[PDB]
């Protein structure tokens, strides 16, 4: 094929779109509604408009290149078309970037600046209450910012296949939202926040917990613990112009101390706990020849998916609490026993790459004697915002260490944030538990990677067992519906709602689609975790000294008695 673009001749054999071919050859073509290899089929944004000689104006993002095409990407007609579309978007957009949470990384603002577009008449809604939905424990909608680009709908479709995010006809105009415009929590929505990640503007956000945290910090009698998820140390640096794949653990500890948190712990400790319980439970099921399979339960998105689509699997879920909740429980029980603090004055805050964690933390039964396991959950973005608001020079901070009591962790706990990490850690402990030995080779590279469905045959003590890692909610649906679950007998199955694992969580920093083309964000974020695992002395959860001390001195033997009674949570289906 011979393609003429802006007077430049190309000879190619590729069968692709104008947009992709142009961007492969460093030709600038703007785009908005195009993301995840699809656009808004109904109301195309037409920001990707180009001029094809003989045909007229076309959308580059969904138009294949053809031999003889003469394309102009920067003609006056094209620019006036694009500018017109952007102006029409501005007509329904509250253009107040000042207090906006996407001010520093908004795509729409970049487009407005680029094409110098102005609204025909500024959209200044006086009461935004009709435009805002904050009923959810995880997600919030601000339709004064919504461009109706459909990116959240497509992302929900491709990531979860639930289509919990839909186009709706409200009042006679189109909005996006949950089924029947209900609160997302009350639908089949997983609260995974992939829709947020896909959003180019501030229309979709996480349910803020920053005020809980601030009020707790400023409350004289409250002792505020903070603990960050595995993924946070591999991600937040992005929001401080430090680049991708940068380990910023120590800087985070320092920043948290400067924020005024009273205790600095780590969720990876909780991960080691979860492994302590779950590996024990797995060995128990192995020696009892059942029941099989056992599913992980640490992902609240997956838990909600099971609740809403496969309740019969609820009794197959591990009873071990997630690292977050198990850490919280221990923070309300064990921690006061080694600190002298009044448990009621303890306020436990987690930092998560996840929006669903907010819902998990606010589950009614996630408490004991009137004390919440977790009192607040802030996302990576929220923590970054809190750091910036405090004018803390994050990139220049010196490394500090976490408080040891519930802050030490192994590499096994460290790799939790990546798909297949929980599986690998769990196997590392379970083999040692079952064989009553301390094995050398602990790396299970078969369960790693971005493959949607991963399988492995592991040999434990005498026999062989089948494990599966489900990478993404849509892949859970595929795994179940295709009957892959019935092809063989599975014994242990990991499920993560977000493809790539928690490193690609709904509470993670937004990334420019261009940088998304430049960088494999999932592998790069996971690389930090695996690198931490490689260079750590202890690489098994049961080799965690602080954790071993905690079990020996307080909880006793895992998987039973005190440990089972306090550190476990069971989901029950309804009759
Ligand atoms: N609880 C918990 Fe987890 C741990 O440890 C996080 O904190 Fe994850 C991450 N990163 C998130 O959110 S949840 C799913 N299990 C894998 S990792
Ligand atoms: S969504 Fe973007 S363009 Fe709209 S107010 Fe916020 S920063 Fe400005
Ligand atoms: S919420 Fe965001 S992603 Fe969804 S249609 Fe509106 S602007 Fe697009
Ligand atoms: S939170 Fe997840 S399941 Fe719910 S609408 Fe958004 S992408 Fe879909
Ligand atoms: S994979 Fe991780 S970030 Fe995504 S919903 Fe599950 S726990 Fe949250
Ligand atoms: S980016 Fe092509 S129609 Fe929206
Ligand atoms: Mg299309
Ligand atoms: Mg305080």
Residue numbers in the entry: 2 to 576
Give excerpts from the publication:
For the same PT pathway position, different substitutions can have a dramatically different impact as exemplified by position E144HydA1/E282CpI. Here the exchange to glutamine diminished enzyme activity to only 0.4–8%, while the non-conservative exchange to alanine and the conservative exchange to aspartic acid retained between 46 and 81% activity. In E282A, two water molecules occupy the space of the missing carboxylic acid group (chain B, Wat717 and Wat974). The distances between these water molecules and the hydroxyl group of S319 are 2.5 and 3.1 Å, respectively. They are close enough to rescue the PT activity between surface water and S319CpI further downstream the PT pathway.
With their low catalytic over-potential, [FeFe]-hydrogenases represent excellent models for a regenerative and likewise economically feasible H2 production. Theoretical studies suggest that the most probable PT pathway comprises of strictly conserved residues E282, S319, E279, and C299 (from surface to H-cluster, numbering corresponds to CpI), including two protein-bound water molecules (Wat826, Wat1120 4XDC19, chain B) located between E279 and C29915,16,20.
